Design a protein around this ligand. Sequence first.
Ligand SMILES: Cc1cc2nc3c(=O)[nH]c(=O)nc-3n(C[C@H](O)[C@H](O)[C@H](O)COP(=O)(O)OP(=O)(O)OC[C@H]3O[C@@H](n4cnc5c(N)ncnc54)[C@H](O)[C@@H]3O)c2cc1C
Ligand code: HEM
Ligand code: HEM
Ligand SMILES: *[C@@H]1O[C@H](CO)[C@@H](O[C@@H]2O[C@H](CO)[C@@H](O[C@@H]3O[C@H](CO)[C@@H](O)[C@H](O)[C@@H]3O)[C@H](O)[C@H]2NC(C)=O)[C@H](O)[C@H]1NC(C)=O
Ligand SMILES: *[C@@H]1O[C@H](CO)[C@@H](O)[C@H](O)[C@H]1NC(C)=O
Ligand SMILES: *[C@@H]1O[C@H](CO)[C@@H](O)[C@H](O)[C@H]1NC(C)=O
Lengths: 529, 134
Amino acid sequence: EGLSIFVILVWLGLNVFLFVWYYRVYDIPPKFFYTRKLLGSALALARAPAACLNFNCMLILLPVCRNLLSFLRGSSSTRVRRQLDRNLTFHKMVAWMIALHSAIHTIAHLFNVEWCVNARVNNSDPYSVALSELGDRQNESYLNFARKRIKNPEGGLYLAVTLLAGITGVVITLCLILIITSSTKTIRRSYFEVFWYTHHLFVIFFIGLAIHGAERIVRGQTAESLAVHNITVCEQKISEWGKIKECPIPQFAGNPPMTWKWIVGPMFLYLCERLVRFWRSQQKVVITKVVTHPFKTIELQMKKKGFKMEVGQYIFVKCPKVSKLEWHPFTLTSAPEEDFFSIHIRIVGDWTEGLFNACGCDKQKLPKIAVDGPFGTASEDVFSYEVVMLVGAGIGVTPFASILKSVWYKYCNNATNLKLKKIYFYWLCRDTHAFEWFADLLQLLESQMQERNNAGFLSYNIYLTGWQKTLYGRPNWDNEFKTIASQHPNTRIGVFLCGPEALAETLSKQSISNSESGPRGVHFIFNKE
Amino acid sequence: QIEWAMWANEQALASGLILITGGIVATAGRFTQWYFGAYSIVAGVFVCLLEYPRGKRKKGSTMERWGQKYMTAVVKLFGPFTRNYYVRAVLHLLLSVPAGFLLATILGTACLAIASGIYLLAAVRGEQWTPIEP
Ligand SMILES: Cc1cc2nc3c(=O)[nH]c(=O)nc-3n(C[C@H](O)[C@H](O)[C@H](O)COP(=O)(O)OP(=O)(O)OC[C@H]3O[C@@H](n4cnc5c(N)ncnc54)[C@H](O)[C@@H]3O)c2cc1C
Ligand code: HEM
Ligand code: HEM
Ligand SMILES: *[C@@H]1O[C@H](CO)[C@@H](O[C@@H]2O[C@H](CO)[C@@H](O[C@@H]3O[C@H](CO)[C@@H](O)[C@H](O)[C@@H]3O)[C@H](O)[C@H]2NC(C)=O)[C@H](O)[C@H]1NC(C)=O
Ligand SMILES: *[C@@H]1O[C@H](CO)[C@@H](O)[C@H](O)[C@H]1NC(C)=O
Ligand SMILES: *[C@@H]1O[C@H](CO)[C@@H](O)[C@H](O)[C@H]1NC(C)=O
């Protein structure tokens, strides 16, 4: 993988460079010499992950800009296209690293706080406590950020609930772990409503992160102070600091916040993207026809000026009356060449029942809707291969309706640009009850072909997992691949799968055993939508 | 509708992991009052064991964590105590309360209390933990 390996390696190398670099920016130089003795080695172990978090937090928001990335990809080598389709895999990777570096940062700041409080209450080595005495009086800046003499562990809890860096750290730690715990695949897939809503604690995370470093409690000796306070002479004269000419009392300042400089651009970009999405919500979509198919599926055929689609693509639809805040995704089930575009919506829950009830499908006006855009990955390649073997399982048949409806148009329109000549379609379903609309499409494509005397084009089988025409039990992929292999010799066939992963491995394995090594031999390229 | 038990499970396991991390960092660093961290180590290990096996949904097909069959057998042995979500929620809250005496484990406590809250929510809904039989 060119782009995937390139982007991952550069991102990992940048993280390693930032960590190593900012580790030694806070470990080697003499500016931080006295802090590194009140805080030890747990200073740099707190500050290098913070730099890595600066970089990572900018990165997390970019591959989730849905409307801006689509605008860029509209103008942006299919080998390349699929690598850049891993934007939500890169988001997950960046987020996990945000967790890792945050955990390192947090643990280091726990030692820091302990040791800071401990020295303040005369429970440490003599030098650190002597350093903790600074900042009690006038004309001296503290080095120890614990100023009240409260013994541990209550001193640590005080600092967290009183220091701004501690309060914001606790708030965004809770708002980072909640995001992560509510973003497992089970939550993301079975209960999307919990994932999406809880994922908005990100606004709280970034707001707490921007004001996180305002206090500048982690302080190093200032440059002017270092110029007058030669450290190597003055370290052992701490008991007389300010009273000998060589050693005035050192002055410590805190570094100005840097995170806002990083996260300003992506939060602005995300806000502009959300405004673009709102603008798409305001745009006109006229719902020309609503057909109520059996078992509660409403086909909404609608027109929106300037919508161009490609086979396999999906859109997001918002109905303001059902939910002002949500956009629910639906696959375009209509041919690209049609004036209207359609989606077939099965009523499975709260918004979908609301659209149904609003439409008037329930009773004996139609609600305003707004379509977001053709998203998704196209399956345009289906047309290129001379033979194809589309296999759809369960609710995965849906993408193939656009493709199947489109082949007919291209056959009628040109009949030569369609390189495709043969389609074998396998529907593996528990039952055909909710997808009866699809059976009708499959019957039609064949019927139109039969009328047009090319009865050869569409061969289909429905196989009912629960146990032309329906059959019982899954297809013997060992048998099927060989049979088509016999009928079509010396030809490349694309097996396109939109079904479960188990089926995906089964077909890929079948493809390769079946595909002939020789250049003359049949190859069975496998693509999984 | 939504099954809060799933998100409660995912939150509770991570609260246990963070409790283990905070307890280990308290014990190794010899934080003053390290025995609370030692408690966090044992409480977090117990939370991770009890919350590793995800339950079976009311509808659909669920995913199982790796090596969950062994844990499911043990959780089944305790009868109603693992099953009830009121017992699970009060257990999580009571185990979280002593961990809140240390900063290194205050994060664990909060997270476990947030989870015990979601368990409470699931308990009000009528949800329970039915095991995933193979
Ligand atoms: C790429 C893609 C293509 C899709 N194509 C179709 C389609 O052709 N026909 C169709 O009926 N449905 C399709 N869906 C999912 C469809 O949008 C949901 O069934 C619908 O949002 C249900 O809403 P609800 O109010 O019933 O939510 P609920 O009934 O509460 O949710 C039921 C299920 O829908 C999922 N879901 C809920 N909200 C969303 C959301 N905003 N995005 C994705 N999933 C969600 C949940 O994970 C849950 O498993 C598609 C989803 C994706 C990601
Ligand atoms: C740690 C695990 C995480 C996972 C698995 C995850 C997963 C996802 C997924 C799948 C999406 C796509 C949403 C969709 O399909 O509609 C998404 C969107 C998003 N994520 Fe994450 N995410 C994680 C962490 C984070 C973090 C840490 C942040 C930032 C604090 C964040 C901010 C976002 C944003 C802003 C969006 C876009 C929301 C939208 O456009 O509606 N995520 N995330
Ligand atoms: C959980 C307890 C946490 C504590 C006690 C803590 C404490 C601190 C402290 C004391 C500083 C230096 C503040 C200053 O110099 O004024 C700081 C900086 C920082 N922390 Fe945290 N933090 C915590 C969690 C987090 C988390 C979860 C993140 C996640 C992004 C984070 C990211 C940062 C960053 C990026 C900085 C650098 C600030 C800057 O340079 O402007 N911290 N933290
Ligand atoms: C607290 O620190 C401040 C600033 O570091 C001290 O104030 C500064 O003290 C010096 C020494 O006297 C002043 O320099 C003098 O300036 C006058 C002209 O104003 C000049 O005639 C003298 O020959 C000498 O150069 C300096 O001006 C003064 N700064 C300010 C802003 O007044 C202050 O003394 C310290 N407080 C204590 C209690 O030590
Ligand atoms: C701090 O404790 C040591 C140990 O007994 C003692 O020698 C020293 O005088 C104490 N200092 C203060 C200010 O209490
Ligand atoms: C600090 O003192 C040492 C010892 O005399 C000397 O070698 C060094 O040059 C001094 N450094 C500065 C910056 O004054």
